[PDB]
């Protein structure tokens, strides 16, 4: 099972964790491995809210924000409310070998700075 790479930059409360079916609100910054930004919540002017664990977003996000749907994984730290983290998402947990040209090319690894602002 391919897992995303998660780096905890600032710990949250360590008690509030999203489960599949929960709604979360996050600040995020999405960049390519070359440093070029392709999307961010700042660009929207509002934090992004979505239901996690249901394929509403890229798998790497679902996996990261639900701790692999509750079953965890090796080197897969949990993201609690208030956690600032860096998510490195391999192509297949993102937009894959096709990608979504010209927004994101084929076989792209995505690097996300995210902060979990709220759960439900």
Residue numbers in the entry: 3 to 122
Q: Which lines from the publication concern this structure?
A:
The 12-kDa FK506-binding protein (FKBP12) is a ubiquitously expressed peptidyl-prolyl isomerase with considerable homology between fungal pathogens and is thus a prime candidate for future targeting efforts to generate a panfungal strategy. PPIase proteins all catalyze the cis/trans isomerization of peptide bonds N terminal to proline residues in polypeptide chains. In addition to its role as a PPIase, FKBP12 is a member of the immunophilin family and is the target of the immunosuppressive drugs FK506 and rapamycin. Three extended loops, which have been called the 40s loop (between β2 and β3), the 50s loop (between β3′ and α1), and the 80s loop (between β4 and β5), surround a deep active-site pocket that binds both FK506 and rapamycin.
